[PDB]
Structures are given as C-alpha cells and as structure tokens.
Symmetry: none
Subunit: 105 residues, 8 copies
C-alpha cells in the first residue's frame, strides 16, 4: 500500500509551483485534483517502461498530500494497479499527478 | 457526470436531520462524510433504485463543495456505465449506506 | 500514529460542540481542535486511574476529519503528554481534553 | 513564553524562499511542517544564532492553528529558556525541519 | 435605485433559515444565489398585482445583503425593471429572492 | 481593555436566539452587526445589568475580525470605564443594536 | 452556460501575470475582479473574437470560485444567444477590458 | 459612507502587501484590513498638514473588495478618528493607516 511519506518529481513540482502562482491552489491540493483528472483519462502507468525518478524537493506525509481523499485515492490505485507493490505504487501515483497537471496544457 | 441539481431520498434526508439534532453537522457536510465512509467499505450500488423525494433539490456544488472532484471521480470509476439519472441514485445510495457506517455502535 | 484511524467523543461532549456551533459558526470538528488545545495549554491532565467516561457519541469520524491540518501537532502533543498510554487510553485522553476544553465555556 | 512578534535568521528565511521557489509552498506553512518534523526527530537546541530575517511577523501569523502545540512543545523541551532564547529554539527547529522535509 | 437598507418577507426569511440548517449557507449569501436562480427563469415581477409585504425581521445594509455582487445585482434589476422606482425595485428584488429560494422545491 | 472572556445577559442571549430562529443568522455575527448599528445610532451606555448568559466565549470568538474596531470604539466612548463595565457597555450596545436590526 | 474548462487569450493572461508582479493577486482572482469591474462599465462583447491561447486551461471552478453563479448569470443576461464557444470569449473579453478598468491612472 | 466606492493604496504599500503574501498566504486585501487595524489600535494618526504621499498603487479596487465584512467597522473607526476630514482626506487617512500597519513588519 502507500508509504508514510512520498515525493513527486522535480518536473512535477515545478508545474505545481506554476499552478500555485496562477491560481490560489497549494501544491498538495493541486496534486489531488491532478490525480483525479489523470485517472479518468486514457493514461495508465506501466512499470516496465518507467524510468523517471521521484527527485522532488518536498517529501511530505501521506496525510498531507492526500488529506480527506486518502481512502478514495487508495481505492483508485488499488483498482488500477492490483499487482504493484509499494515502490511501484508510489511511481504510479506520481506518474498520475504528473499526467494530470501536464494536461493543464 | 452528476447533474447540476440533485436530491436525496426522504429517509436519507430525514436521517441527516436526525444527525444534525445530535451533533451540529449540516446535511450537506454529513453527506460528504457519509459518501466517503461508504466508499471505503464494500458497499456498491446495485440499480435493482430509490426515488429521490427529499424536500430540497440543491446544486451539485452546495452538496459537495471541495469534495466534488473526488466524488465525481469515485462514481466514474465504480459506475462508468450509468448516465446521469442513475449516477445521482448511485451517489444517493452511498450517502444512505455511509450514514449507518458513520454511526457509533456506542 | 498511535491514535487510531477513527474515533468518537462522548455524548456529553458532542452536545456541547453542537451548542457552540449554535451560537458561533464553528463546526463541531473545528471546535474539537480548539477545545483540545485550550485544554492542553492549561492544568487539566488525563489520568487512566480516574476515568469512568463512556465515549458514546453519535459519530465515529476519521482522525483527519477531527484533526485536519492539526493532526501531526495533536499526535505529537499526545505522545509527549502521554508517553506510557496505549491506543485505547490515548483516545480517552484526547476525548477528555476535548471535553475539558469545551466545558470551559459555561457560567 | 514565546514573544508576540518574531523573525527567522536571514539564512533560514532564504531556505524557506528556496522551498517556495521549487514548490510554491508558503514559508509560514513550510515552517509549521518543518517545526514538527524536527521535534519528532531527535534534534534539539542548545545555545551552542542571529535572527536577522527580513520579516517580523505576529506569532499567530507564523503558527496559525499550531500556535498552542508549538508553545507547549517549546516549554516541555526547553523549560529553562527565557523569551529571548525560545525564539532561537523555534528558529533552530524550523531550520532542522527544512532539512528533514528535504 | 436600491436604498441603503432592506428586508425580505417573513415567508422568505423562514425559507432562508431552513436552507441555513440544511446547508452551511448564510441567509445573505443564499439570498444572492436565489436572486440569480430566479432572474434566469420565467419569473418576472409586476407591480400592479403585488400585494405581499416585506415584513421581515432582519433589515440589513445593502452591502451586507449583496456583498461583491452589488453591481451585478443592480445591473440585472436595471435591465428587467427600467421603469420601477426605489420602492417598487425593492419589492422586485425581494420577489425574486422569494421565487429563487422557493424553487429549491 | 475588554477581558479575554465574556457573556451576554440571558435576556440578550435569548434575543439573539430569537433572531436565529427567524433567520438562521448566527448569534455572534448578529452581535457584531448589532454593535456597530447601535454605536452609529446615538445610543450610549450609562450604568444607569446582569451578565447571566449561558455561554462565555473567547473575545475573539465573539468579535472575530471586528475585535480591534470594537475595542477602539469602546475606549473612545467610555474612556473611564474599567474592565468589569466595558463588558456591560458592549452588552448594552448589542442589545440596542438588535432592536435597530429589528 | 460556460464550458467546464476555460482559457484566456495570451495577452490577457500576460497582463494578469504583470498585475501579479506589482501586487500579489493571482490571475484567477484578478480575473474575477476584472470581470465585474468591466460589467459595471458600458463594455459589451461584440463577436466581430480573440483566439484563446493562454498557457493554462482551467476548470470553471478554479477560475471563478464563489463568483461562478453571478458570473454565469451576468453572461446569460447579456449574451442570451451565445452557445458555449462564444460565451467563453464573452467572458474572456470582459476580463481583458476590466484589467484596464482596474488600472490606477496613478 | 464617506469613503468613496473605490480607492487605491500607494505603490510603496502595495509592494509590501505583495511580500507579506509571499511569506504568508495572506492576500493583499485581507492584509490591508489587518494592517489598518493594527495601526489604528496604536499611536499613529494621520494628519493632513503632514502629507506628501502620492497614492500611486497599480489597482483602484472597490471598497468592498478592500474592506469586506470589515467595511462598516472600518468606516466607523475612520469617522470617529477623523470627524473633520473630507472624502479626499479620508482616503489618505485610510491609506496612511494601511501603510503604517504594514510597515510594522520589518527589522
């Protein structure tokens, strides 16, 4: 399942920062909304072709990232990645946040 | 996606008002809470179906506030086929089931 | 985390949270945060050998619902004030503090 | 007790601005996260340094809804420290916490 | 134009109170939203058949009722009731709030 | 100065509950509106009465973002009144303000 | 009504970012402010028409927050005929005109 | 109302409001409210015969935008502190207070 703390990639963090400056939305709230936007599009994560590293500056607590959407987020990851282990599941979460935020255009 | 204007069944709404008598929490907030409590259990909506005769028909936004995105997403994930008249009953079934699932067995 | 994923307050407490909401805009879960901290910065302290208080509140809400952004802080205060207590007792301690904090609004 | 108004060191301010540069996270919210992350770790302040930050802010502005917890934590760890030095204990934890946030 | 202070009817006030208990929404915010809901339906106010009195308990300041939607509200009243005077215009505003809130069903 | 914690009279509390009964407006927000409506009118407190209300609330809970204005208004009108009586001046304006709100 | 996802033209967005350089106000909030300032003047949108090449495409809600209801209502009142692709340009024209109308002549 | 429907701050002030937002979440208009009141509960007082301050801020915002729910309160404070001032001077007085209140956050 999901670990106590995680980080996004730098590539993702920077886009969250731009979104922060354009809208009021804080990186954690924005990462939640981007996750939802991504999971309801065609984008799906696959381990055998992931190479991107979570080199992000901010390593927040799971509860801080996900707030009162934790259970809903863990449900979604569970349905879409039934066979991934904790280390892959973080990548999928992060890949989804990257995709969702990228889609802001 | 969910229609712009939604309503719960009369019992569910009645039970939210009961919950408001004991705590001070308002029906719309209580419903956000119940929806998510429900969703983490094993409850799934099966059309069979309740008619939506709650006294108020409110905006999607008044109902769900900042939980609107997660709410729509969970529904889309669990009931991808259901249109709009069916989705609102999916949402409504989850609220009602979550109310009993928020209840302290004392 | 030594507080569980979800917990309830007492009936006595819930009812006082409701009334504060009546007079103020303050929602029960936010008032619980405020009550906890006004209690914890005073002299009141939970102790397990003086506890005949049943947590018979109506609602078992998620920890995140109750605590919100004050979660980490709350759990750190509880750990420091109550190092020897087990989960069962930590819930009673958190609840006792919410009750004490909110009782401080009568007379 | 913690004084009504306080600043970080310039260095720790710049460290908070750095984090905002990378993420958009707000210095004062970052400072709350740092503080508790630092305390939970076993880091501790001992005299052995200069609070020359740009901004002095109301104690409530820095800490918001974490004020009580912060004040209570500081009194428990540093029951001897007087006003002047409680700021430096808080400032030290913020700085350590920022490393712990990464 | 609109006067410094006004009141709704008791009939309207009570429905705002029920909406307050059902949702978080305060009577003034709710009166704004109900105004918008009403003005975009078929309902239109007419003086020669109004008899309802604004017997409301709360006589708030215009700015309190309308907040940062004042200019938008006064634009709408202006377009829909170009010939009404202050005393009629309050009735139209109030009639619209009544209609909008009633429409919650 | 206004004390950290205060109550209305029972009577004025009930008057605030009455308003909530009719409208849903929140006693403490009603109290802020009343206060300023009363002061703007020419109503004024003179000793010549009992604050036996149910709820005692933090000064910040009553007044929120109007605290400063309220405290400044009270000092200007009643520069002589001491803590004990500033509450009764505030309570009197709230009660008068409620009549003025209707 | 307005589409779920909207964008300003590039100049308007550029001018909002300039406004952010001087004050700290964010583009979305500044746009709420500019829209209403615009609407109280005599400016009306005439299709002729700007293409919407702003760097971000955001949700209606992120853009308008609690002003969404008044915003949609004003547009419905002033441009009852315009569909959806046209409404967003109506909104966008108002933001741009309101920015100059929020500007202090110093 | 003797404050106009809309007003501007000085450039100097706007810039300090922006920086406070940088460090805190606090939006410029909310900070203006807070600055005004922290200024007005102190010793600072506007006086027209000592005023070479041009209000050259970028934005002319609505009074309601600036003041919000604090409107009535603000206007009542200004009326009591500045009974003899005309609208033109009341704006300068409100602005001077916002500047003073916000300057109090350096060193």
């Amino acid at each position: 399942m999901l670990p106590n703390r995680m980080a996004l990639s730098r590539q993702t963090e920077d886009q969250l920062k731009k979104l922060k400056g354009y809208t009021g939305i804080t990186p954690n709230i924005a990462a939640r909304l981007a996750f939802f936007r991504s999971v309801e599009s065609e984008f799906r994560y696959s381990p055998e072709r992931d190479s991107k590293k979570l080199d992000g500056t901010l390593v927040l607590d799971k509860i801080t990232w996900l707030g009162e959407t934790l259970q809903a987020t863990e449900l979604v990851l569970k349905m879409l990645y039934p066979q991934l282990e904790q280390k892959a599941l973080i990548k999928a979460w992060a890949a989804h946040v990257e995709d969702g935020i990228a889609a802001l255009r």
